[PDB]
Amino acid sequence: HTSPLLAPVRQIHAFGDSYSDNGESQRLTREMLAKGIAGAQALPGEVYWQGRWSNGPTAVEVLARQLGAQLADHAVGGAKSGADNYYGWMSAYRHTGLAGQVDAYLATLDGKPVDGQALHFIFVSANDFFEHEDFAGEQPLEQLAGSSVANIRAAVQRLGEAGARRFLVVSSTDLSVVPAVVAGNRVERAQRYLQAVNASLPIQLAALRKTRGLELSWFDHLTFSRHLRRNPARYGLVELDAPCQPTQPSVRPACANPDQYYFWDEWHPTRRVHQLAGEAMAARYAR
């Protein structure tokens, strides 16, 4: 039997990576290019919709629309669970990982109170994995997962300490079906990493929830994606594995029917999957 719905939400503060970013990596990289910072590149790029790493709004944007909430989206494409970003060249300019986004949010508050009604949405860890695999991290994956789990738990603790009361923490996504991961022959490594994160993190967050009297909801994005991919026609999906918009090794023409595709590029879901994700996230809350 389902539980009672959670109380309504009128403000979201979102923290995370390219699965949430609604314009920050574009703002920041435009700024860094204006200033000639070393190694700066225009992100996300020309084949993306309005600075999102997709062809439409991210899940958290749809969540906020569903719930009737305003959204302050702090997420930065590339963000890791710690201080920094998949893009190493950002570090000298700004710490845009989850820990840096939390630092910057608390610094903006003047010492002024956290909104105890706002939902603090956290969705990160993919880039921990992508950076480890793309640049030959040597940390065993089990230790990398441990680090991601500790980093997310510390972010919840630090936001809670400052006065946050309501959380929604997204699990790892199914990195094992990401087209870049398939092409790198890294399906088993992604499986092992995401299973470790998703087994450990909810145990840690529930202990924190209880200690600090928080409301903290866990969104299992792996169960979400497995249900969609097992029954694609129910949602109007046709192509689960090919990127609609290939970028590697070069940019090719977008597919004719993007709403029938799971993946936009080699890492990111399409607007359709973000819409279904945001609707699924919204299901635990009253409007």
SS (HEC) of the chain = CCCCCECCCCEEEEEECCCCCCCHHHHHHHHHHHCCCCCCCCCCCCCCCCCCCCCCCCHHHHHHHHHCCEEEECCCCCECCCCCECCHHHCCCCCCCHHHHHHHHHHHCCCCCCCCCCEEEEECCHHHHHHHHHCCCCCCHHHHHHHHHHHHHHHHHHHHHCCCCEEEEECCCCHHHCHHHHHCCCHHHHHHHHHHHHHHHHHHHHHHHHHHCCEEEEECHHHHHHHHHHCHHHHCCCEEEEECCCCCCCCCCCCCCHHHEEECCCCCECHHHHHHHHHHHHCCECC
Contact of 75 with 21, CB cutoff 8 Å: yes
What does DSSP say about strands 166-170 and 239-243: parallel, antiparallel, or unpaired? unpaired
What structural domains and CATH numbers belong to the chain? 11-282 (3.40.50.1110)
Entry resolution (Å): 1.4
Tokens at residue 185, please? 């022959």
Contacts with 68 (C-beta within 8 Å, 6 or more apart), sequence order = 8, 9, 10, 287
Contacts of 221 (CB under 8 A, 6+ apart): 170, 171, 172, 173, 174, 277
Judge residue 161's burial from the number of C-beta atoms within 10 Å of its C-beta, 0-12 exposed, 13-18 middle, 19 or more buried. exposed
